[PDB]
From a paper:
[name] is a tubulin homolog GTPase protein that is widely conserved in bacteria and plays a key role in a complex called divisome, which carries out cell division. [name] polymerizes into protofilaments to form the Z-ring that acts as a scaffold for accessory proteins during cell division. [name] treadmilling, a motion in which the protofilament polymerizes in one end (plus-end) and depolymerizes in the other end (minus-end), drives cell wall synthesis that constricts the Z-ring to form a septum of the cell. In order to aid high-resolution structure determination of the [name] protofilament, we developed a [name] (Mb) that binds to both KpFtsZ and EcFtsZ with high affinity.
Author numbering:
A (entry chain A): 11 to 316
B (entry chain B): 2 to 89
């Protein structure tokens, strides 16, 4: 399976280079922007410069309308780098210009080519502007028309995990990290499979044409690692606005090392099924990390949540 | 990297106490590693609660150096550790 990750925009950009520098495993990273300076600056490997004319390569003035135009120009340049993927992750901080109206355009040339298209996006912080927070909401509904799954992480929901004395530089690195965990938490099930493996087909059958989705994660250690992590994942603040008993599909990733106990897999499984509708498609698998010992990570993606 | 600082703040001949900085985001627990440098010792490691910023590493030899490295296990990231070597 060929998995392409595409950070469109200023926010999206720095997020995927955080995923290039920290490295995501068995995945190909792409930088998309209008501002040509960022492309030279960022260290990703494959930069895509859209809108070279209708922008002059001088950014989208925080203006979504030219965002959609700069990419409604180069759909064939997007398609050129896109052709052949099986799954694409589009990563953008919503609210700007480049990554607000052009991410739905990338979503559609990909979804047109029949790629499995999963958008992973931030809602801006309260302190950022009513206009950003309304720019973001409007880009998320048109993006909602050209994706199989949309994961929205409201950056405000990180204030509940961010200490005070916190610099805004830190506040956006924290959001960089959650965009990454959302992609890594799903990709690794395809690229780093474990003994209870999920095929690409099983991801597709749980993410294809499902609309809105949210995700939570949790890590624990020791005797009770499996029950503490799953609970940390179910009660995550990035999942607390949804009602997991009402999603058409739950996808669960247990990242563990070789010492994962049979009864622990059973435990995570049975606790997820206890909060999920009896009709939801529940896909529970493992991804292997041989560096992990007596710890455990549980990621949960509720898909089609309303 | 998380933590971003990790320095020895107090020392005896047979034990150190390292003190890291406080996270921008909530850590569940820290994974503290130390084993022989190259010598395939089982490393052993140990864990401390996420609320802590120091840790006592005890029963050391005023001699051989080890692989001091603090892992931050956080539900909200998977950032890479911070490290040091020390032979007392
Ligand atoms: N994760 C992340 N999000 C960001 C960053 N900078 C800005 N954002 C978010 O992204 C939104 C749009 O910013 P930006 O990407 O620069 O606009 P664009 O280039 O026109 O898409 C902001 O309202 C922020 O919430 C960043 O460095 N990392």
């Amino acid at each position: 399976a060929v998995i392409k990750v595409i950070g469109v925009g200023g926010g999206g950009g720095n997020a995927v280079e955080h995923m290039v520098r920290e490295r995501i495993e068995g995945v190909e990273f792409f930088a998309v922007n209008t501002d040509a300076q960022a492309l030279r600056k960022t260290a990703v490997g494959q930069t895509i410069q859209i809108g070279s004319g209708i922008t002059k390569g001088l950014g989208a003035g925080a203006n979504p309308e030219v965002g959609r135009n700069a990419a409604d120009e180069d759909r064939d340049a997007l398609r050129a780098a896109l052709e052949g993927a099986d799954m694409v992750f589009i990563a953008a901080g919503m609210g700007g210009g480049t990554g607000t109206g052009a991410a739905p355009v990338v979503a559609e040339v990909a979804k047109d080519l029949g790629i499995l298209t999963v958008a992973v996006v931030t809602k801006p912080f309260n302190f950022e502007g009513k206009k950003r927070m309304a720019f973001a909401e409007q880009g998320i509904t048109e993006l909602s028309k050209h994706v199989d799954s949309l994961i929205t992480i409201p950056n405000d929901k990180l204030l509940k995990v961010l200490g005070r004395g916190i610099s805004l530089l830190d506040a956006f690195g924290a959001a960089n990290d959650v965009l990454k965990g959302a992609v890594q938490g799903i990709a690794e099930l395809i690229t780093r499979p474990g003994l209870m493996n999920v095929d690409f087909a099983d991801v597709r059958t749980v993410m294809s044409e499902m609309g809105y989705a949210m995700m939570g994660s949790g890590v624990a250690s020791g005797e009770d690692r499996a029950e503490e992590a799953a609970e940390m994942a179910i009660s995550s603040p990035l999942l607390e606005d949804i009602d997991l008993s009402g999603a058409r599909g739950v996808l669960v990733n247990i990242t563990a090392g070789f010492d994962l106990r049979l009864d622990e897999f059973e435990t995570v499984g049975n606790t997820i099924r206890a909060f999920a509708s009896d009709n939801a498609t529940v896909v529970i698998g493992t991804s292997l990390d041989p560096d992990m010992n007596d710890e455990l990570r549980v990621t949960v993606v509720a898909t089609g949540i309303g | 990297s998380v933590p971003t600082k990790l320095e020895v703040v107090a020392a005896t001949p047979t034990s150190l106490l390292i003190s890291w900085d406080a996270p921008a985001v909530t850590v569940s627990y820290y994974r503290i590693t130390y084993g022989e440098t190259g010598g395939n010792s089982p490393v052993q490691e140990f864990t401390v609660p996420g609320s802590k910023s120091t840790a006592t590493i005890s029963g050391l030899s005023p001699g051989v150096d080890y692989t001091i490295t603090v892992y931050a296990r956080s539900a909200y990231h998977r950032r890479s550790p911070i490290s040091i070597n020390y032979r007392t």
